[PDB]
Amino acid sequence: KTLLVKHADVLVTMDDTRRELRDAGLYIEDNRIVAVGPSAELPETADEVLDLRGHLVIPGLVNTHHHMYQSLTRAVPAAQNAELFGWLTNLYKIWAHLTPEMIEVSTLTAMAELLQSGCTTSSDHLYIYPNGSRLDDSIGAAQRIGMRFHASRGAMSEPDILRDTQRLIETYHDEGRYAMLRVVVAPCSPFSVSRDLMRDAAVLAREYGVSLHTHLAENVNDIAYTPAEYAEDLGWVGHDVWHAHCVQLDDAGIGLFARTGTGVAHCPCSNMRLASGIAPVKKMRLAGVPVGLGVDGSASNDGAQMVAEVRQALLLQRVGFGPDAMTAREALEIATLGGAKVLNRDDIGALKPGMAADFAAFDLRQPLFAGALHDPVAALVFCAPSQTAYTVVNGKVVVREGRLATLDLPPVIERHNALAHALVEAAR
Ligand SMILES: [Zn+2]
């Protein structure tokens, strides 16, 4: 099956030479990009053709941290103005009533919000499995909606954790190029499980060639309870590892992550709404640490508009460090190539031959972009956050003219709100 994209106003490839083409497109075979360049230099037709004149086309955005199930409990009254501990104790009273269906529905809802904002690849971090829920429930939802997924097997405490983790890797992990599903070993944090499980997880992961992920140095209490030394000691450093938040990562931790290729998932909005603080991303990048973007759990954001996160990261770094702390293209790179690096994949994040057919298209004719066409690429970050006109994943159109095309979304969200209400009802 061939897919041809032509006449895009601007096409940022994020390729070897960071090309940004005008009046360009892509030639796709099944789920792989075979050709990228000026439209005149590309085939004139394909099985499906998207003439994106008037549009900004970008490689699919990559989300590197989430708690999708939290989409069911957003803006809960007791969580709105609480500090981490109160936020936690109240929300746990609610999450303890989660069901297999809720895990399925919330995954569909969260992925829909991401896809509709330009995000084509996403990981998640489901660390609780109540009332018989399973990672399997999220994976099924991801396969139905069509999002490239990195399903994490999170956990809190133990022997069962490891068996399930292995079961899931063997069942769902696809190490082949263009994989739409991959598994990740992810205990919630080094302080939520024993150091024994932490060591076991690392070896388990390295045995199957999968990645490791967890929360690290997100607040002041974490340090007092260093985090990076603790991580290196447990073997949690390497190209196959990435930690979320790291707002409190010290200079030594940074140097360490940089030399080992250990990644970090920056979540600006969450870091603000929960007041964790400003992570030194300007410093991290200067030090060479691979950084990606994360919307984080919907109970702590509470939105999931990926372009807005890219914008928030740029705005945040600048208020804490100055106008040259981060450029629009830098933010967009972290949201693309950075997310890929962090997930340890080289088959996404860029529009060029041999890469996965994932990309986002934005309509430059919207009023929000009016007067910003002096630099359409920068505009995506400097202007109000835009929804995509089209979202393509694995060569398939998932969002068409702003609508979810892989499934009928309204009944899903109606059910989502109905389950969200029943959930909070059960708790109270
Ligand atoms: Zn998190």
Residue 30 CA to ligand 1 centre (angstroms): 34
Strands 181-187, 148-155: pairing kind: parallel
Residue 69 CA to ligand 1 centre (angstroms): 12
Helix (H) or strand (E) holding 420: helix 409-427
Q: Resolution reached, in Å?
A: 2.2
Residue 360 CA to ligand 1 centre (angstroms): 25
Structure determination method:
X-ray
Residue 67 CA to ligand 1 centre (angstroms): 6
Tokens 């992550």 belong to residue: 257
Q: 212: which 2 tokens?
A: 């490791």
Task: Judge whether 402 and 366 are in contact, CB under 8 Å.
Answer: no
Residue 186 CA to ligand 1 centre (angstroms): 11
The DSSP code sequence of 283-349 is HHHHHT--EEE----TTSS----HHHHHHHHHHHHHHHH-TTS--HHHHHHIIIIIHHHHHT-SSSS
3-state secondary structure of 55: strand
Provide the CATH number for the domain formed by 61-345+405-428 in this structure. 3.20.20.140
3-state secondary structure of 382: helix
Burial class of residue 159 (count of CB atoms within 10 Å of its CB; 0-12, 13-18, 19+): exposed
Task: Judge whether 381 and 328 are in contact, CB under 8 Å.
Answer: yes
Residue 287 CA to ligand 1 centre (angstroms): 24
Helices 159-172, 135-145: axis angle to 10 degrees equals: 20
Residue 359 CA to ligand 1 centre (angstroms): 26
What is the DSSP secondary structure assignment for residue 367, as one 8-state letter? Answer: G
Tell me which architecture the domain covering 1-60+346-404 has in CATH. Answer: Roll (2.30)
What is the DSSP secondary structure assignment for residue 126, as one 8-state letter? Answer: B
Q: 391: which 2 tokens?
A: 């979202």
| 40: Cα separation from own chain's centroid | 34
What is the DSSP secondary structure assignment for residue 82, as one 8-state letter? Answer: -
Residue 367 CA to ligand 1 centre (angstroms): 34
Residue 331 CA to ligand 1 centre (angstroms): 20
**Domain extents for the chain?**
1-60+346-404, 61-345+405-428
Residue 303 CA to ligand 1 centre (angstroms): 14
Q: 176: which 2 tokens?
A: 């082949």
Q: Distance (Å, rounded) from C-alpha 250 to C-alpha 264? A: 13
Does this chain's domain 1-60+346-404 share its CATH topology with 61-345+405-428?
no
Q: 19: which 2 tokens?
A: 């090309």
3-state secondary structure of 107: helix
Residue 263 CA to ligand 1 centre (angstroms): 15
Tokens 């024994």 belong to residue: 196
Q: 289: which 2 tokens?
A: 């640490």
Residue 127 CA to ligand 1 centre (angstroms): 10
Residue 137 CA to ligand 1 centre (angstroms): 19
Residues 265, 136, 72, 191: what is their CA dihedral angle, to the nearest 10 degrees? Answer: -50
Helix (H) or strand (E) holding 121: strand 119-123
Residue 150 CB contacts under 8 Å (≥ 6 apart), including other chains: 121, 122, 123, 124, 182, 183, 184, 211, 343
Task: Judge whether 318 and 326 are in contact, CB under 8 Å.
Answer: yes
Alpha-carbon separation of residue 44 from 27, 140, 393 (angstroms): 9, 37, 22
Q: Distance (Å, rounded) from C-alpha 342 to C-alpha 330? A: 16
Q: Distance (Å, rounded) from C-alpha 71 to C-alpha 69? A: 5
Residue 29 CA to ligand 1 centre (angstroms): 36
Residue 329 CA to ligand 1 centre (angstroms): 26
Residue 152 CA to ligand 1 centre (angstroms): 12
Q: 367: which 2 tokens?
A: 């009023």
Q: 11: which 2 tokens?
A: 């096409």
Q: Distance (Å, rounded) from C-alpha 426 to C-alpha 67? A: 21
Query: Taking Cα atoms as reference points, which of 299, 297, 269 lies closest to residue 76?
Result: 299
Residue 293 CA to ligand 1 centre (angstroms): 12
Please state, as a whole number, how many other Cβ atoms lie within 10 Å of the Cβ of residue 17.
Answer: 7
Please report, as a single letter, which amino acid is at residue 199.
Answer: R
Task: Specify the length of the chain in residues.
Answer: 428
